[PDB]
Design a protein around this ligand. Structure first.
Ligand SMILES: [Mg+2]
Length: 758
RNA sequence: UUACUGCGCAGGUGACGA
DNA sequence: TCGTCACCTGAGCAGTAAC
């Protein structure tokens, strides 16, 4: 067993002589870093200023002399390494600092892609795609108790349209509504100027503007987004444009794919190693071996968790390693107890889509047949219901109507339901042009609002989805059917876990930031989800209707304390029973929040039981990546020479970075989509230092199980449902807070068991 | 807004300290 | 009020759906 990292060992001196002096006000640090520039590295920490002489010659410095040892206090050399790595690469210019980030000098993938697919155009040479390397010096533990410093290498692509705006007009590219950014930017200033309304003389007209309502064509380029790229190129190349993207895709894979990335990291290391890195003029550092995660000798830095089982009965007999293979065979987890076996479902659609909807509904309810083995049985027989009655609600509305769409939908729903009687759920079909209208006239959010107020949960769908070719539709209907069943109060599947303790609660927090435009300032909302341990199973609990970011810390403990009281009454804990509480979020909580949570929970359950509490954070966007060299990968498809997910660690691999931090692999070769897919990056799982429960390996495995618990999809989610579901609830409820005639009254009455947020 | 995955860009934000 | 280490969020395009 061995997993290789994207980092290199850094040999540092055992000791270093530093000059220190008390400096309670950090305000004076910036001026001193300038005064001593060139001769001293300077660093502020815990009320004191530290000075490392990096070059002989004055000026001089006062204070106590102390020997800072690397093994004990690695943070000083780690910080110094940020600057020293830059100085060691003078022919590479820093596009950003800490981490030190720079670009490849020779390579440019659009040029190479033009040659490879054989395309040619004038302005093509003004669309630049340049590899981007970052070097992050990070502290890690080979074994518990000992800390070292490693330099980790990450690669990205810099997309940039330096083409002038006057050129893109004359070539027939419509610039109306494209975002625009500055060329020179600009001691700490903003880049985003605004959107393009039209161009005057040597002047652009900006709506949704960040500052001024206009700028010179010279002081403004398009932002290097996919959107802007695809929009420009397609107008300059179509239909030969798709040929360029496949070509560009091949080039990028030349840096992103496992073997390629491993190679690129290897080559980066040799280059950094080829000379000593001058920490000072007399003090040297040196890049060593590629850092590994292994169980070699005293080290215990890698394990593979078992496969996640999907469970479809209360005992645990019926199970599978995939959700859909399991559901097809056994049916949903709660079939025996599922109350409503003849659900009436409202279907709201533009009258002009009648025929296309009927077929989609036919496929959904009654299946696509054995020719399309992804979705054969159809919703009814799949979930083990008697039947599904549709109440058809056509809407006199057209895609071109972008101001009256929402009132037309709501009028039609209102008038339909007035007769009709009670409906248990609804499906709403949307025009592509209506899907992203502002919330004041968006039919998605307004129908959602109306129907959720009335206690009717909805699964919505856009017309391009309804019109998918059969081969895609079958997978679409898998997800559609799973979510709809869950919105009808269903429990499709669970994941295995054998209870070691008498009860286990996991609560998660998710964040949404809402805004009508980029210019407009973003308002923050928060959601809370809960997962319980059961007999052999994890069970999704109740969900918040509380919303605002302010007092989020209070909302957490109220959810926790109220739930703990409910759990204690329900399960009636014995003296000496252990209760565990775990918190998940994408950010760490404050120490004061942890202390407060801990106190309130502890006293609420009382002294009769033992309380274990852990506060976990989950990162997607860190500098670590895992490489498994024993992984040959899988056929890109049955059955070619190309392979996908080469060098990709198995799903469930857990690597030890430190005492509080683990790396979790989630995307196996099986799940990786195609040959050009980059090497996956693992989830970083971090335990808050004030946690009373400590087994982070267990918690990393628990987080993995919770990615399989999502009923949005048949395939696992990117993050555990505790956070993911909470983000969805934060977005919806945040958006609904601005829709008139919205009430949450039914969220814990008619919708109490509905997973309406999927 | 069936989703998953990936990526680009943009905005910044979080925690810890004194 | 600021240093320091860290990485989150939203929008949108494109390819593919775990023996
Ligand atoms: Mg959904």
């Amino acid at each position: 067993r061995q997993l290789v990292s994207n980092g290199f060992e850094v040999n540092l001196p055992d000791q270093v002589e530093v000059i220190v002096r008390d400096l309670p006000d950090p305000s004076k640090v910036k001026e001193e870093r300038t005064r001593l520039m060139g001769y001293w590295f300077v660093h502020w920490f815990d009320g004191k200023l530290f000075h490392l002489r990096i070059k002989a010659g004055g000026p001089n410095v006062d204070g106590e002399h102390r020997a800072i040892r690397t093994a004990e206090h690695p943070w000083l050399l780690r910080a110094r390494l940020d600057d020293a790595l830059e100085e060691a690469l003078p022919k590479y210019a820093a596009v950003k600092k800490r981490p030190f980030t720079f670009l490849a000098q020779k390579d440019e993938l659009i040029d190479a892609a033009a040659t490879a697919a054989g395309l040619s155009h004038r302005l093509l040479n003004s669309f630049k795609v340049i590899p981007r390397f970052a070097l992050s010096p990070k502290i890690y533990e080979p074994v518990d108790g000992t800390t070292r410093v490693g330099v980790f290498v990450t690669i990205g692509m810099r997309y940039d349209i330096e083409a002038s705006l006057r050129d893109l007009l004359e070539a027939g590219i419509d610039l109306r509504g494209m975002y625009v950014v500055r060329r020179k930017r600009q001691p700490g200033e903003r880049g985003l100027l605004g959107r393009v309304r039209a161009i005057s003389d040597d002047m652009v007209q900006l709506f949704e503007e960040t500052d001024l309502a206009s700028v010179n064509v010279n002081d403004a380029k398009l932002e290097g987004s996919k959107e802007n790229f695809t929009r420009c190129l397609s107008a300059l190349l179509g239909h030969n444009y798709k040929k360029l993207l496949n070509a560009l895709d091949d080039q990028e894979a030349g840096y992103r794919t496992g073997p390629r990335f491993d190679d690129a990291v290897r080559r980066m290391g040799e280059f950094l190693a080829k000379k000593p890195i001058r920490l000072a003029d007399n003090i040297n550092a040196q890049v060593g071996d590629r850092i590994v995660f292994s169980n070699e000798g005293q080290a215990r830095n890698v394990r593979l968790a078992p496969k996640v089982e999907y469970v479809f009965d209360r005992t645990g007999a019926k199970s599978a390693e995939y959700a859909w293979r399991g559901l097809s065979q056994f049916g949903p987890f709660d079939r025996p107890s599922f109350a409503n076996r003849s659900p009436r479902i409202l279907v709201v659609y533009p009258s002009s889509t009648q025929g296309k909807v009927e077929n989609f509904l036919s496929a959904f309810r009654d299946g696509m047949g054995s020719n399309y083995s992804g979705f054969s049985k159809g919703f009814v027989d799949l979930m083990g219901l008697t039947k599904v009655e549709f109440v058809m609600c056509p809407v006199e509305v057209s895609s071109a109507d972008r101001n009256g769409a929402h009132t037309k939908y709501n009028s039609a729903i209102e008038d339909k339901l007035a007769g009709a009687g009670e409906v248990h759920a609804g499906i709403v079909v949307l025009f592509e042009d209506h899907a992203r209208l502002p919330d004041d006239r968006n039919p998605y959010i307004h129908t959602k609002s109306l129907l959720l107020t009335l206690g009717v949960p909805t699964q919505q769908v856009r017309m391009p989805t309804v019109l998918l070719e059969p081969k895609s539709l079958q997978y679409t209907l898998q997800n559609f059917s799973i979510a709809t069943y869950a919105k009808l109060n269903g429990t499709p599947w669970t994941v295995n876990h054998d209870k070691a303790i008498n009860d286990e609660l996991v609560v998660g927090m998710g964040l949404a930031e809402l805004s009508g435009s980029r210019t407009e300032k973003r308002q923050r909302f928060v959601g809370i989800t809960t997962v319980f341990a059961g007999d052999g199973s994890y069970l999704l609990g109740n969900v918040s209707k509380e919303c605002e970011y302010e007092g989020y810390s209070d909302a957490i403990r109220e959810s926790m304390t109220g739930i703990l009281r409910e759990l204690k009454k329900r399960n009636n804990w014995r003296p000496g029973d252990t209760v565990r509480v775990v918190f998940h979020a994408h950010r760490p909580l404050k120490r004061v929040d942890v202390a407060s949570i801990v106190f309130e929970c502890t006293r609420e359950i009382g002294s009769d039981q033992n309380i274990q509490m852990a506060f976990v954070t989950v990162s997607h966007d860190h500098p670590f990546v895992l490489i498994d060299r024993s992984e040959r990968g899988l056929e890109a498809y049955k059955g070619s020479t190309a392979r996908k997910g080469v060098f990709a660690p198995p799903r469930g691999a857990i690597s030890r970075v430190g005492r509080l931090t683990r790396l979790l692999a989630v995307n196996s070769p099986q799940l990786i989509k195609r040959a050009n897919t980059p090497l996956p990056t693992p989830l970083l799982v971090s335990l808050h230092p004030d946690s009373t429960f400590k087994d982070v390996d267990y918690l990393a495995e628990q987080a993995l199980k919770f990615t399989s618990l999502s009923w949005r999809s048949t395939l696992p989610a990117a993050t555990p449902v505790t956070i993911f579901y909470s983000e969805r609830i934060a977005e919806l409820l945040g958006r609904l807070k601005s829709i008139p005639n919205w009430s949450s009254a039914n969220l814990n009455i008619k919708l109490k068991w509905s997973r309406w947020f999927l």
